[PDB]
From Swiss-Prot, chain D:
GO terms for cellular component: cytoplasm; cytosol; extracellular exosome; nucleoplasm; nucleus; proteasome complex; proteasome core complex; proteasome core complex, alpha-subunit complex. It comes from the Eukaryota. Induction: Down-regulated by the ribozyme Rz3'X. Up-regulated in colorectal cancer tissues. Belongs to the peptidase T1A family. This is Proteasome subunit alpha type-7.
Swiss-Prot record, chain F:
The 26S proteasome consists of a 20S proteasome core and two 19S regulatory subunits. The 20S proteasome core is a barrel-shaped complex made of 28 subunits that are arranged in four stacked rings. The two outer rings are each formed by seven alpha subunits, and the two inner rings are formed by seven beta subunits. The proteolytic activity is exerted by three beta-subunits PSMB5, PSMB6 and PSMB7. (Microbial infection) Interaction with HTLV-1 TAX protein favors NFKB1 activation. It is found in: Cytoplasm; Nucleus. The keyword Phosphoprotein applies. SMART domains: Proteasome_A_N (SM00948). One of its GO terms (biological process) is proteasome-mediated ubiquitin-dependent protein catabolic process. Keywords: Acetylation, Cytoplasm, Host-virus interaction, Nucleus, Phosphoprotein, Proteasome. This is Proteasome subunit alpha type-4. Belongs to the peptidase T1A family. GO terms for cellular component: cytoplasm; cytosol; extracellular exosome; intracellular membrane-bounded organelle; nucleoplasm; nucleus; P-body; proteasome complex. Its main location: cytoplasm. The modification Phosphoserine is found at residues 12, 74, 172.
From Swiss-Prot, chain G:
It is found in: Cytoplasm; Nucleus. SMART domains: Proteasome_A_N. This is Proteasome subunit alpha type-5. Expressed in fetal brain (at protein level). The keyword Nucleus applies. InterPro entries: Ntn_hydrolases_N, Proteasome_alpha, Proteasome_alpha-type, Proteasome_alpha_type_5, Proteasome_asu_N, Proteasome_sua/b. The modification Phosphothreonine is found at residue 55. The gene is PSMA5. The modification N-acetylmethionine is found at residue 1. The lineage of its organism: Eukaryota, Metazoa, Chordata, Craniata, Vertebrata.
Curated annotation (Swiss-Prot), chain I:
The gene is PSMG1. It comes from the Eukaryota. Pfam families: PAC1. It comes from Homo sapiens. This is Proteasome assembly chaperone 1. Chaperone protein which promotes assembly of the 20S proteasome as part of a heterodimer with PSMG2. The PSMG1-PSMG2 heterodimer binds to the PSMA5 and PSMA7 proteasome subunits, promotes assembly of the proteasome alpha subunits into the heteroheptameric alpha ring and prevents alpha ring dimerization.
Length: 97, 238, 233, 238, 197, 250, 232, 245, 275
């Protein structure tokens, strides 16, 4: 489609990865480990896939609380215009699909 | 009695100050049968006491790569997982570096593999001890692993069921082994295996597998009546 | 009976059909720092009691009355940590709304969105509700507005209300006092007096804080202004 | 003990939680099946009226394909999902295979979906059971049963949910090739088996008639009542 | 997939949109066209403030003190300055202090770097924050330099020639805005002097 | 039971989920919403539960949230749950109106949120959305309808029904004094006041302690129309005039 | 000096003091709750037979349960839970399909049971409540196997599993000999299934499916069963 | 958590009590006190200060390795009181977050905003069922362009606030009261005066007329906005001057 | 014990007091509830019957037919020892068998020598449940405790069950211990158990019954690393034979130990969960 397609698709991946690299190299192995364990715990707390979820704990742990991007303000996913079956959506998240 | 509260997780300590579910995995070695493992300067022998005749063929001794294999005493799901892991380690050592994998190193890889579970919730200790016998540049090897993530280097050992009998034999003749042949070292291993057996029972080329690697020798699992020739020479339970 | 199993978990209903972790997060609210919202003719007042009344405190640091956009702010009783992260979010959603609709977020709209955060945090398991309630006021469409969002995420428009401590006493005094036509020059005094009902000490620019909405928009009253209102009452 | 988790066994060797979803089936509304001579019929009782309730919105016989239909008799919302999803998978098959979709195929899907909900205790098995009748490409009449446990099974006469055994036992007798030969007789049979199930006849009954040529096409309560009066005239003759 | 959908730029038309391009181009046919600033823009530093010149205006808002000219695409200059405005309002709201021109600059640069100048925001970013009168040269590709003066867009060369000829290290306010006006005058269209102190 | 009453994944010996039955009890303790499907339209009469003297109304309706042009719903149960559920009802309808350009037929929309609420039982770690909603509807298929949904997903269709407080009581009063086929919206609005007034003991249905919304059809357009203070004041004073006339008759 | 209620037997992860995972052995009791499946590997093939335990004359005996085909040469006989059998049948069948779509070879019986013990041994959040019995005649030659809750496999010459696992494996112990023919295996499986079954063996209440080096895995018909179980 | 929440009101952090209390944050305040030291900060005209009594019980333990004074950046210090591991971890987190702020913007984190960040990280620990508070009390000092000295403290429970004197740890509340009356009669304290107040507050409430190696004085001045702690000689000279006058 | 992230979960009890509170309830003493646990009561009983009368037996075996010894065995290896040593010789005609179900279980057959109806035997290879153990003492013993009856209880235990200062692996793979009654005036033969060490279940039930009605009884407890048919375990039940308790019952040890050879080679189909 476009170069930016994938640069934006994996934007967050290929940033927090770089954060963990920096912390490994300066602070130590512990510093990524600690941040990772917090993030995964607070993104085991959201709604089922099929309802649009407000993950205040994960956002403020990243420092996104006080920062907007195009991610937020384009292609509004909270008024998603294409949703599936509740049960089948949840199965996909579980990895039964 | 108080250990009640703290024995049912692998990621909880007790007031007493010990994780009991790792000690229970180290009791689950004993639910599997008596493997012996003993080495010389030329060869590293294993033997296995195979607990129907038609059903449950029971493959106690397993071959990992040319230079290396194991025998199994305890949980068999875990035995499989651990062996298969080692096969991959050695495959990759001979794919990238195009050499064998040190036995010490491969037992250390299994060590850390088996520590993750014990220090993790939703996990349990691999409930099996191995006798990990390879040959390197170094010379022959035996390496006991425990169901607990800790492990040993050995020149002789037995793990499994009523296996103290074997351990005792292997201390009595520990010195012989260093300077034995292939077949001498094997009969020594089999006499440890026979010390474990009741006196009413015997080896009778039936409950005998023999897993020998060495200098030019590759890890070869003698079973059924490929163990007959080794047991030819062995004589006189007395 | 004790029925304590039901009163630990926030995902359970009780035998009779109660959600009890909600009620205990509203108990955290109901042991809060007295606030009073009085939506008056010429804007709203959010006159509140400060959880510090100390010789040792930096006046410029902490604010009970925070703006979200120009024209909106809010005040709280219950939890400070919780309040602060909820209003970081509030500000985000106001600016998202102004990048989508280019309209300063209506007080009602913002209230819905911050109460939809509250909705999620009672819904899910392995979290707690927020132990804080929000008097989100502000001025739109030539009109004053006051609301009251909850731990649960139920929100309701108000002419006059109170939360925190002696807060039912607050609303009793304020039912006797508040007039529909009461304008904001007189509502700040009324809110100061509703605090006097739910106060413990001597009341000063230090020991309370006030902040008001208007035609103009939302602000906090300067220590000077607050003590001048206390001197005028 | 082992009825406080979906995914645990017992010394006696049971998943009791899965059998409790089958007790939720057992608290059903009698759904009856027959698989006759180029006919299938699904009589199922209406159970309750509630004077001022639309009946369209609450029906016990749902159609899955041109040549598949079913009669559910457990929980209602659980069954709604199962049936919605049986139509999803029916359409997937139909599109890809280019076939008027087998009955067996989608009984196996319904079964495997309930098996997918049997294999977590952070999920629950749909506590519903369906008599998925119909025909094949060629036109072979079918009747099946699907279970919360998540097995499919093939049948000729069936009777599930409320008073399951009662009405199955009626069919053990009254299901015969001279009550099957014609489509009249198979309609009569399910009605007369529901005249064991429930007191009222042509009143609380809701009866599907799919043929080799035709599809579900739910009957009128006047049509069923005619056949209730036909078997009543047979009872007057006997 | 049965995966919750997310927000941002959607890259789905792209290849089919490029099939439209290919067809229409080939036959000799028009497709709707991107709308631009095509503005002369300008900026200066003086003793204790900034001026931002433009022609008709290109000068957009960031913060009470920070303003930001727009050359390049009009869509994209306006979009970036508005989003960065909102970001620095959020920053300021929590901080307690009016936001900085270093903050504006870092953010703009980093955002325009992520999207690799496929979005046309060649901006002259001038504010007078606590640390004093700052001017930058934000570029579409997420580059920038911190310059005493800079011009971009439609006659930038003529404007920059005026600037560099008729600049003094520490100006007065009125001679500073005089410079940006005569620089705009060279590139050109009403002179657009957004003066800052 | 004391067990099988926790996770909403855990069945009983009987085959009962007591969690979901306690979500039904949470409807039990909510605003009486009394719907009566009529000939001319379909009305949504109510108890306007929260009527404090300091409490303000800056909204169009209290418990009654409208879905598209052609549908509206009511709310009895957990208020926060209901807020997100009623936002979701609008969004469901609009996705069908984006793909097929038709205002969602009524059964579809009810069923869609029932699948949501059936997931919120199926999957343990979620709470059974403790709301029932009474959906006044028109569609091209089934003229006018009244519906219900439950926390379970168990949903129905009705000629008259209730949710909330004294709900079974109210349905009994409807089963006495409803006449399917004769019931114009006029006589349904009369029955609605009557049954509310008979089931709950609120002075003489104080007009700010009741609310109605009438989904009718006028010049082939669906008209979801809240009854004014004035207009439920007219319905209740006329109900009371008839009560007094009948008191003179007896 | 006090009695304690300590449970290691609710959790499949939890070890007894002796070092026992009870839930796996409680799933062995669930294999024993299922239906008897007798396989006999020979020199001239491997047979699988298995009881259908048909209960009513309303349930369709014409339909085939309890036995499956996975490729040409290999199938298995399921026994314990049919719902759990299914997901391991699918593994075997797709991974040997993939073997034929990779190497243009049909996967060896030992390697199919490897593939199946990769989908098993992964607790599905419970010890698989099925035992399969993988009888194929591969490249190497005839082969019977046995799968269990723990997830692993083991090689067999004569195995009975299910209802009367050891009731019918003791019959195999007397009956089977190394130089068995596939005909012998067929008849012996069946006649021992007959003397296990509380019902009388006809062709309707048994699935047999058997493979030889020559004649690839097929499902013994009504008539073939009838003939053998007339003789036996 | 993976293991989950804990039946009982004071047994998990995501269970509210009948009264509406979270009790494991109150036990994270008991973990401040478990520390076993007191800290006192004193704000002034020119300086912000952070002093703490010293302990190194083992002769062998090299006394150079054992401090409660750390810095986060050049310009901004803290002193800690509470559990060693957790306090080192919160110091390390403040460094990551100060660097994150500076990377994002290109000017360094304010004292109050770093305290706010650490308090929001604490808010998340206390709302989530997996994580627990770091039982440590960070007392940031540093000079601000506009606002000058900034004595701010952040909590395990995760409440941040500004102050003109702070006291935390064991004698926390006793020293808070000492400082109330000092500050009531404040003399726009310069470097000397702020350090005097702080040292002698700890030397009153613990009653330990200190040696230089029985306190640790961290301090920052408008003069030297680099946070910089005293030498044995300097902190001795302070105590000597407090003994002389 | 959490099926989702952060499920409010409680600890396992030592006292089962919540289970005692469930007792209190009886499922709110509901008619269907109390009916179905009485269906479980008639599921989970004992039912002493012999298959010579092919009836059921009512009151007693030991007060019904004469008792002089009564030789108990509680476990595979305990009943293997009575199969091996005692009953290599004699008739030991069956008079009784406790017919029971519990989740875990397996035969509970009673005998008495033809020569000496006096001397008695039990082989409990099954498990009898905590509720069924007093029902079992209300079958074979019945009522009228004699105190004229040497109750030679044998039991197979796990090495791990034994409390000691060394580890459960450090213990010798086999041993056996005793616990014998006030009355019982013959040798413990093995060492008696330690103070921390206790027993429970049916063997305990028998010795405790015996003690309260002061009867000679002894509880031999074969703390072996195996719980399955083993030559070493049954030759660690050996010592019993060379005491009074089992002296006139054992015969011909050559015959016995060749029969034990048979017991071992009976074999299992042993599951593939260890190798």
């Amino acid at each position: 489609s476009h170069p930016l397609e994938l640069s934006e698709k994996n934007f967050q991946l290929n940033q927090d990865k770089m954060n963990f690299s920096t912390l490994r190299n300066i602070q130590g192995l512990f510093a990524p480990l600690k941040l990772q364990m917090e993030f995964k715990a607070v993104q085991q707390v959201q709604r089922l896939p099929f309802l649009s979820s407000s993950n205040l704990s994960l956002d403020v742990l990243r420092g996104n609380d006080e920062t907007i991007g195009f991610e937020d303000i384009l292609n509004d996913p909270s008024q998603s215009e294409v949703m599936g079956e509740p049960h089948l959506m949840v199965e996909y998240k579980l990895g039964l699909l | 009695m108080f250990r009640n509260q703290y024995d049912n997780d692998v990621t909880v300590w007790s007031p007493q100050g010990r994780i009991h579910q790792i000690e229970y995995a180290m009791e689950a070695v004993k639910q599997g049968s008596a493997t012996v493992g003993l080495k010389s300067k030329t060869h590293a022998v294993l033997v296995a006491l195979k607990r129907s005749e038609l059903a449950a063929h029971q493959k106690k001794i397993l071959h990992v790569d040319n230079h290396i294999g194991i025998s199994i005493a305890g949980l068999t799901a875990d035995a499989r997982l651990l062996c298969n892991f080692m096969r991959q380690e050695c495959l990759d050592s001979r794919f990238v570096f195009d050499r064998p994998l040190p036995v010490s190193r491969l037992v250390s890889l299994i060590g850390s593999k088996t520590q993750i579970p014990t220090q993790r919730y939703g996990r349990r200790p691999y409930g099996v001890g191995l006798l990990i016998a390879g040959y390197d540049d170094m010379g022959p090897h035996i390496f006991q692993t425990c169901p607990s993530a800790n492990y040993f280097d050995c020149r002789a050992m037995s793990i499994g069921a009523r296996s103290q009998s074997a351990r005792t034999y292997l201390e009595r003749h520990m010195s012989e082994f260093m300077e034995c042949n292939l077949n001498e070292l094997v009969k020594h291993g089999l006499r440890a295996l026979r010390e474990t057996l009741p006196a009413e029972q015997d080896l009778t080329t039936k409950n005998v597998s023999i897993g020998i690697v060495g200098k030019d020798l590759e890890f070869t699992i003698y079973d059924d009546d490929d163990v007959s020739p080794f047991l030819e020479g062995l004589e006189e339970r007395p | 009976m004790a029925e304590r199993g039901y009163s630990f978990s926030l995902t359970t209903f009780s035998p009779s059909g109660k959600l009890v972790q909600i009620e205990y997060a509203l108990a955290a609210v109901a042991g809060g720092a007295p606030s009073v919202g009085i939506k008056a003719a010429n804007g709203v007042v959010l006159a509140t009691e400060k959880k510090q009344k100390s010789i040792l405190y930096d006046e410029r640091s902490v604010h009970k009355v925070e703006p979200i956009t120009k024209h909106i702010g809010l005040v709280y009783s219950g939890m400070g940590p919780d309040y602060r992260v909820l209003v970081h979010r509030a500000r985000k959603l106001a600016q998202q709304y102004y990048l989508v609709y280019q309209e300063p977020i209506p007080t009602a709209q913002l209230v819905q969105r911050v109460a939809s955060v509250m909705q999620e945090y009672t819904q899910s398991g392995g979290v707690r509700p927020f132990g804080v309630s929000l008097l989100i006021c502000g001025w739109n469409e030539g009109r004053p507005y006051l609301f009251q969002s909850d731990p649960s995420g139920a929100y309701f428009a108000w002419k006059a209300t109170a939360m925190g401590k002696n807060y039912v006493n607050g609303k009793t005094f304020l039912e006797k006092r508040y007039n529909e036509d009461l304008e904001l020059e007189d509502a700040i005094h009324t809110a100061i007096l509703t605090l006097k009902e739910s106060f413990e000490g001597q009341m000063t620019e230090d020991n309370i804080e006030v902040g008001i909405c208007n035609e103009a928009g939302f602000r906090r009253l300067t220590p000077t202004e607050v003590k001048d209102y206390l001197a005028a009452i | 003990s082992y009825d406080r988790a979906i995914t645990v066994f017992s010394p006696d060797g049971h998943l009791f939680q899965v059998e409790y979803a089958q007790e939720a089936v057992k608290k059903g509304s009698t759904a009856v099946g027959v698989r006759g001579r180029d006919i299938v019929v699904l009589g199922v009782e209406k159970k309750s009226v509630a004077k001022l309730q639309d009946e369209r919105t609450v029906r016990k016989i749902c159609a899955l394909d041109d040549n598949v239909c079913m009669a559910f008799a457990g929980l209602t919302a659980d069954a709604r999902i199962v049936i919605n999803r049986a139509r999803v998978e029916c359409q997937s098959h139909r599109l890809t295979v280019e076939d008027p979709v087998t009955v067996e195929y989608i009984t196996r899907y319904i079964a495997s979906l309930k098996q997918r909900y049997t294999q977590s205790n952070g999920r629950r098995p749909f506590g519903i059971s369906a008599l998925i009748v119909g025909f094949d490409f060629d036109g072979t009449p079918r009747l099946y049963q699907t279970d919360p446990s998540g097995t499919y099974h093939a049948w000729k006469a069936n009777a599930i949910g409320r008073g399951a055994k009662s009405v199955r036992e009626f069919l053990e007798k009254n299901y015969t090739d001279e009550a099957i030969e014609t489509d009249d007789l198979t309609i009569k049979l399910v009605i007369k088996a529901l005249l064991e199930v429930v007191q009222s006849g042509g009143k609380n009954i809701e009866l599907a008639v799919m043929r080799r040529d035709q599809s579900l096409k739910i009957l009128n309560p006047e049509e069923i009542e005619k056949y209730v009066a036909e078997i009543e005239k047979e009872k007057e003759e006997n | 997939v049965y995966a919750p959908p997310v927000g941002g730029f959607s890259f789905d038309n792209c290849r089919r949109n490029a099939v439209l391009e290919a067809d229409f181009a080939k036959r000799g046919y028009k497709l709707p066209k991107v709308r631009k600033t095509g503005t002369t823009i300008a900026g200066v530093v003086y003793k204790d403030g900034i001026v931002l010149g433009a022609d008709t205006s290109k000068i957009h808002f960031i913060s009470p003190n920070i303003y930001c000219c727009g050359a390049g695409t009009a869509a994209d200059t306006d979009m970036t300055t508005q989003l960065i405005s909102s970001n620095l309002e959020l920053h300021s709201l929590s901080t307690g202090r009016l936001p900085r021109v270093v903050t504006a600059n870092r953010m703009l640069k980093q955002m325009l770097f992520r999207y690799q100048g496929y979005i046309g925001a060649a901006l002259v970013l001038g504010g007078v924050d606590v640390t004093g009168p700052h001017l930058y040269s934000i570029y579409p590709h997420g580059s920038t330099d911190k310059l005493p003066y800079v011009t971009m867009g439609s006659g930038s060369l003529a404007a920059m020639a005026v600037f560099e000829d008729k600049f003094r290290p520490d100006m007065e306010e009125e001679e500073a805005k005089n410079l940006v006006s005569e620089a705009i005058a060279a590139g050109i269209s009403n002179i657009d002097l957004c003066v800052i102190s | 039971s004391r067990r099988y009453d926790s996770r909403t994944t855990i069945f009983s010996p009987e085959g009962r989920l007591y969690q979901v039955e306690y979500a039904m009890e949470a409807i039990g303790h909510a605003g009486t919403c009394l719907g009566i499907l009529a000939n001319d339209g379909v009305l949504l009469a109510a108890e306007r539960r929260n009527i404090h003297k300091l409490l303000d109304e800056v909204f169009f309706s209290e418990k009654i949230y409208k879905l598209n042009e052609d549908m509206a719903c009511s709310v009895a149960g957990i208020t926060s749950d209901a807020n997100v559920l009623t936002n979701e009802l609008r969004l469901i309808a609009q996705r069908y109106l984006l793909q097929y350009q038709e205002p969602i037929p009524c059964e579809q929309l009810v069923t869609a949120l029932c699948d949501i609420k059936q997931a919120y039982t199926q999957f343990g770690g979620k709470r059974p959305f403790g709301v029932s909603l009474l959906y006044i509807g028109w569609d091209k298929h089934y003229g006018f309808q009244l519906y219900q949904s439950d926390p379970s997903g168990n949903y129905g269709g009705w000629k008259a029904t209730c949710i909330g407080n004294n709900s079974a009581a109210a349905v009994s009063m409807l089963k006495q004094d409803y006449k399917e086929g004769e019931m114009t919206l006029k006589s349904a609005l009369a029955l609605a006041i009557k049954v509310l007034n008979k089931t709950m003991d609120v002075s003489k249905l104080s007009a700010e302690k009741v609310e109605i919304a009438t989904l009718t059809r006028e010049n082939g357009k669906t008209v979801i129309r809240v009854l004014k203070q004035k207009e439920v004041e007219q319905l209740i004073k006329k109900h009371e005039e008839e009560e007094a006339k009948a008191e003179r008759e007896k | 000096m006090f009695l304690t209620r300590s449970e290691y037997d609710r959790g499949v992860n939890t070890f007894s003091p002796e070092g026992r995972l009870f839930q796996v052995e409680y799933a062995i009791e669930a294999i024993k709750l299922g239906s008897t499946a007798i396989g006999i590997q020979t020199s001239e093939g491997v047979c699988l037979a298995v009881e259908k335990r048909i209960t009513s004359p309303l349930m369709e005996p014409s339909s085939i349960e309890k036995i499956v085909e996975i490729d040409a040469h290999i199938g298995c006989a399921m026994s314990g839970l049919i719902a759990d059998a299914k997901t391991l049948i699918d593994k075997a069948r797709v991974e040997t399909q993939n073997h034929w779509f990779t190497y243009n070879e049909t996967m060896t019986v030992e390697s199919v049971t490897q593939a199946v013990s990769n989908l098993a041994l992964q607790f599905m959040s419970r010890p698989f409540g099925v035992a399969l019995l993988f009888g194929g005649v591969d490249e190497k030659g005839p082969q019977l196997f046995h799968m269990d809750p723990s997830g692993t496999f083991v090689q067999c010459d004569a195995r009975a599993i299910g209802s009367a696992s050891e009731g019918a494996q003791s019959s195999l112990q007397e009956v089977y000999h190394k130089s068995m023919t596939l005909k012998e295996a067929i008849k012996s499986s069946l006649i021992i299934l007959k003397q296990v079954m509380e019902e009388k063996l006809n062709a309707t209440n048994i699935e047999l499916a058997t493979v030889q080096p020559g004649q690839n895995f097929h499902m013994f018909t009504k008539e073939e069963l009838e003939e053998v179980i007339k003789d036996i | 958590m993976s293991r989950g929440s804990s039946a009982g009101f004071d047994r998990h952090i995501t269970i509210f009590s009948p009264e509406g209390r979270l009790y494991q944050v109150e036990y994270a305040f008991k973990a401040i006190n478990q520390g076993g030291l007191t800290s006192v900060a004193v704000r002034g005209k020119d300086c912000a200060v952070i002093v703490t009594q010293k302990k190194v019980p083992d002769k062998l333990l090299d006394s150079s390795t054992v401090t409660h004074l750390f810095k986060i950046t050049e310009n901004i210090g803290c002193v800690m009181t509470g559990m060693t591991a957790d306090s080192r971890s919160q110091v390390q987190r403040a460094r990551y977050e100060a660097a994150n702020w500076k990377y994002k913007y290109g000017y360094e984190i304010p004292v109050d905003m770093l305290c706010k960040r650490i308090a929001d990280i604490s808010q998340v620990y206390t709302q989530n069922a997996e994580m627990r508070p770091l039982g440590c009390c960070m007392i940031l000092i540093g000079i601000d362009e506009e606002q000058g000295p900034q004595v701010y403290k952040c909590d395990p429970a995760g409440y941040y606030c500004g102050f003109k004197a702070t006291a935390a740890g064991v004698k926390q509340t006793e020293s808070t009261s000492f400082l109330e009356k000092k500050v009531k009669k404040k003399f726009d304290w310069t470097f000397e005066q702020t350090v005097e107040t702080a040292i002698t507050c700890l030397s009153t409430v613990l009653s330990i007329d200190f040696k230089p190696s029985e306190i640790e004085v961290g301090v920052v001045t408008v003069e030297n906005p680099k946070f910089r702690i005293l030498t044995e000689a300097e902190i001795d000279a302070h105590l000597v001057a407090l003994a002389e006058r | 014990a959490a099926t989702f992230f952060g499920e409010v979960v409680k600890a396992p009890c030592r006292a089962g007091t919540e289970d005692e509170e469930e007792e209190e309830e009886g499922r709110r003493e509901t008619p269907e509830d109390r009916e179905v646990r009485l269906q479980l009561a008639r599921k989970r009983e004992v039912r002493l019957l012999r298959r010579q009368t092919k009836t059921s037996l009512e009151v007693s075996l030991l007060e019904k037919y004469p008792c002089s010894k009564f030789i108990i065995a509680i476990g595979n290896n305990a009943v293997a020892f009575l199969s091996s040593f005692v009953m290599n010789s004699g008739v030991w005609e069956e008079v009784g068998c406790a017919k029971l179900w519990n989740e875990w279980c397996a035969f509970c057959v009673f005998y008495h020598l033809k020569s000496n109806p006096s001397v008695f035997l039990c082989q409990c290879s099954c498990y009898v449940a905590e509720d069924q153990q007093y029902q079992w003492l209300e079958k074979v013993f019945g009522s009228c405790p004699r105190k004229n009856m040497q109750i030679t209880i044998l039991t197979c235990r796990h090495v791990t069950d034994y409390k000691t200062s060394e580890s459960t692996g450090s213990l010798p793979s086999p041993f056996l211990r005793a616990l014998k009654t006030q009355n019982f005036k013959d040798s413990a033969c093995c060492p008696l158990l330690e103070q921390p060490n206790i027993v429970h279940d049916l063997p305990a039930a028998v010795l405790s019954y015996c003690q309260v009605w002061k009867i000679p009884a002894i509880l031999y407890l074969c703390y072996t690393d195996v719980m399955k048919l083993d030559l070493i375990t049954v030759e660690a039940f050996k010592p019993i034979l060379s005491t009074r308790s089992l002296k006139g019952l054992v015969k011909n040890i050559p015959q016995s130990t060749e029969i034990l050879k048979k017991l071992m080679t009976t074999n299992e189909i042993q599951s593939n969960i260890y190798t």
